[PDB]
């Protein structure tokens, strides 16, 4: 049955919590235990209050995200289809209580410095249920790194890492991410020169450029095992297909066109659509500390531009990884 918050966030861990992100879903905090940072995602469930302007999910509605988190985390320890490019899942708990005052303090600090679009989560009663997901800390999102990357060479490593992770998940799980906006691509420093993956038993490497990429946020994702499909049915959602002002919002429409509004089906072209949106961000919105000033950098730019104009003619991330010249 549900545990108190203190089960997940013993005092010292709660005292070290800093807010790092948010969405309509709820709140994300960073903390530390056994000298290791972790990210804690907290989602209210089962209650009647609007939270951030939206109804709370039921436990049945939140289960897909929990299941998908686990399956993608487990890919780091598999053999035939192996990738560390998702995000590690450490634990999941169902908690009952009002929001901890120490988390309110962290929430207020973020509101003061960065500003929040959410409600201050101070209105929950002591019977409120939450899902608390503890993840590996994955670094900083690509959107927050808009002005922080070295060069377009780094962009190439990032797109290769994303494409490989998505391909491995296609092959093992018939996975579609379905919401891979640039807030959901995390970057962390690595001392490894090369990152390793295995796709259908064939192992390969990717030069890191000093960064390891982690894909997060499985709210809209789909996968299947042995014919049992886990997904978010958005066929009757209005608002998801009516956004404007960013190619992101076109991707939701383009996915609905590809799948004829049947969200249980497998359409791995959606992963190609998201990779095209990310490549577009790399070329149009990211700005690098070092431009392509030399001939050999102008070449990497030309190859990423060629990827942008050709990739929509590939059927899946697997097709892109295996056949696109960018990755040869
Ligand atoms: N595991 C993690 N490690 C680091 N940061 C994380 C996570 C999960 C989420 N975030 C941050 O919170 C924002 C909202 O999902 C994301 O956009 C992102 O900024
Ligand atoms: Na990862």
CATH, residue 8: 3.30.200.20
Give the separation between CA 288 and CA 192, rounded to whole angstroms: 22
Residue 36 CA to ligand 1 centre (angstroms):
16
Token pair recorded at residue 49: 């209050």
Question: Cβ(12)–Cβ(35) under 8 Å?
Answer: no
Query: Do residue 172 and residue 299 come from a single domain?
Result: yes
Residue 1 CA to ligand 2 centre (angstroms):
30
* 27 in a labelled binding site: yes
SS3 239: helix
Give the separation between CA 194 and CA 206, rounded to whole angstroms: 5
Segment (H or E) for 225: strand 223-225
* 265 in a labelled binding site: no
Q: Is 179 a catalytic residue?
A: yes
Q: What angle do CA 142, 144, 146 make, to 5 degrees?
A: 70
Q: What angle do CA 281, 304, 283 make, to 5 degrees?
A: 25
Q: Which residues on adjacent β-strands are paired with residue 222? A: 176
Query: Do residue 52 and residue 187 come from a single domain?
Result: no
Token pair recorded at residue 256: 């609905």
| 269-284 vs 247-259: helix crossing angle, rounded to 10 | 160
H helix intervals, the chain: 5-8, 11-15, 59-74, 101-113, 152-173, 247-259, 269-284, 295-310, 317-323
- Closest approach atom of ligand 1 to CA 22: 14
Question: Cβ(267)–Cβ(255) under 8 Å?
Answer: yes
DSSP string, 153-188: HHHHHHHHHHHHHHHHHHHHH--B-S---TTSEEEE
Side-chain half-sphere exposure of 251, counting CA atoms within 13 A: 22
Token pair recorded at residue 143: 């959107």
Give the separation between CA 29 and CA 41, rounded to whole angstroms: 7
Residues 6+ apart with CB under 8 A from 84: 75, 76, 195, 197, 212
Question: Cβ(299)–Cβ(159) under 8 Å?
Answer: no
Give the separation between CA 85 and CA 101, rounded to whole angstroms: 34
User: Residue 225: which CATH number?
Assistant: 1.10.510.10
Question: Cβ(87)–Cβ(135) under 8 Å?
Answer: yes
User: Count of CB atoms within 10 A of residue 60's CB?
Assistant: 9
**Terminal Cα-to-Cα distance of the chain (whole angstroms):** 51
Query: Do residue 181 and residue 318 come from a single domain?
Result: yes
User: Count of CB atoms within 10 A of residue 6's CB?
Assistant: 13
Give the separation between CA 51 and CA 56, rounded to whole angstroms: 7
Nearest to 197 by CA among 75, 328, 87, 68: 75
Nearest to 62 by CA among 190, 213, 230, 186: 230
How many structural domains comprise the chain?
A: 2
Query: Do residue 158 and residue 278 come from a single domain?
Result: yes
Q: At which of 137, 169, 189 does a domain end?
A: 137
Give the separation between CA 24 and CA 270, rounded to whole angstroms: 23
Token pair recorded at residue 189: 């420093």
Query: Do residue 2 and residue 145 come from a single domain?
Result: no
Segment (H or E) for 207: strand 202-207
- Order the strands of the 185-189 sheet from edge to edge: 140-141, 185-189, 211-215
Give the separation between CA 76 and CA 64, rounded to whole angstroms: 20
Deposited experimental method: X-ray
Residues 6+ apart with CB under 8 A from 276: 308, 311, 312
The sign of the dihedral angle between the CA atoms of 232, 235, 239, 243 is positive
Query: Do residue 2 and residue 24 come from a single domain?
Result: yes
The structure was resolved to a resolution in Å of 1.5
Nearest ligand, measured from the Cα of 140 = 1
Residues 6+ apart with CB under 8 A from 194: 205, 206, 207, 208
Judge residue 91's burial from the number of C-beta atoms within 10 Å of its C-beta, 0-12 exposed, 13-18 middle, 19 or more buried.
exposed
- Closest approach atom of ligand 1 to CA 216: 8
Nearest ligand, measured from the Cα of 161 = 2
Query: Do residue 6 and residue 19 come from a single domain?
Result: yes
Question: Cβ(134)–Cβ(39) under 8 Å?
Answer: yes
Give the separation between CA 143 and CA 8, rounded to whole angstroms: 29
* 88 in a labelled binding site: no
Token pair recorded at residue 134: 């503890």
Which residues contact ligand 1 via a Cβ below 6 A? 20-21, 23, 28, 39, 87, 135-138, 141, 183, 186, 216-217
Nearest ligand, measured from the Cα of 137 = 1
Question: Cβ(87)–Cβ(136) under 8 Å?
Answer: yes
Give the separation between CA 11 and CA 314, rounded to whole angstroms: 50
Structural domain boundaries, residue 116: 1-137
Instruction: Kindly tell me the number of DSSP H helices and DSSP E strands found in the chain.
Output: 9, 14
- Order the strands of the 89-96 sheet from edge to edge: 18-23, 26-33, 36-45, 129-136, 89-96
Residue 300 CA to ligand 2 centre (angstroms):
25
* 137 in a labelled binding site: yes
Query: Do residue 124 and residue 256 come from a single domain?
Result: no
Reported residue count of the chain is 328
Give the separation between CA 137 and CA 191, rounded to whole angstroms: 16
Q: Where do we find the tokens 């436990």?
A: 59
Token pair recorded at residue 184: 């959901």
What is the DSSP code (8-state) at residue 42? E
SS3 289: coil
User: Count of CB atoms within 10 A of residue 12's CB?
Assistant: 10
Query: Do residue 35 and residue 85 come from a single domain?
Result: yes
Residue 213 CA to ligand 2 centre (angstroms):
6
Nearest to 180 by CA among 40, 53, 85, 296: 85
Query: Do residue 41 and residue 98 come from a single domain?
Result: yes
């Amino acid at each position: 049955g549900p545990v108190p918050f203190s089960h997940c966030l013993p005092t010292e861990k709660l005292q070290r919590c800093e807010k790092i992100g948010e969405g309509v879903f709820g709140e994300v905090f960073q903390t530390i235990a056994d000298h290791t940072p972790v990210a804690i995602k907290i989602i209210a469930i089962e209650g009647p209050d609007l939270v951030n302007g939206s109804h709370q999910k039921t436990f049945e509605e939140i289960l897909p995200e929990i299941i998908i988190s686990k399956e993608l985390s487990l890919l780091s320890g598999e053999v035939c289809n192996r990738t560390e490019g998702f995000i590690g899942l450490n634990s999941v708990h169902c908690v009952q209580g009002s929001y901890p005052p120490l988390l309110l303090k962290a929430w207020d600090h973020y509101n003061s410095t960065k500003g929040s679009a959410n409600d201050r989560p101070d209105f929950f009663k002591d019977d409120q249920l939450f899902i608390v997901l503890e993840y590996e800390f994955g670094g900083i999102d690509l959107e927050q790194m808009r002005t922080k990357l070295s060069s377009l060479a780094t962009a190439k490593s990032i797109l290769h890492q994303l494409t490989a992770s998505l391909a491995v998940a296609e092959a093992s799980l018939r996975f579609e991410h379905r919401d891979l906006h640039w807030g959901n691509v995390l970057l962390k420093k690595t001392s490894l020169k090369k990152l390793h993956y295995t796709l259908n038993g064939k192992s390969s490497t990717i030069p890191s450029c000093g960064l390891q990429v982690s894909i997060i946020d499985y709210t809209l994702s789909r996968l299947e095992r042995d014919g049992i499909v886990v997904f978010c049915d958005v066929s009757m959602d209005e608002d998801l297909f009516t956004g404007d002002g960013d190619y992101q919002f076109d991707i939701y429409r383009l996915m609905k066109k590809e799948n004829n509004n049947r969200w249980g089906e497998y359409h791995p072209y959606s992963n190609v659509l998201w990779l095209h949106y990310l490549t577009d961000k790399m070329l149009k919105q990211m700005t690098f500390k070092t431009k392509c000033n030399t001939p050999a950098m102008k070449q990497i730019k030309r190859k990423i531009q060629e990827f942008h104009r050709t990739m929509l003619n590939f059927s899946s991330a697997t097709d892109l990884l295996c056949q696109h010249s960018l990755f040869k």
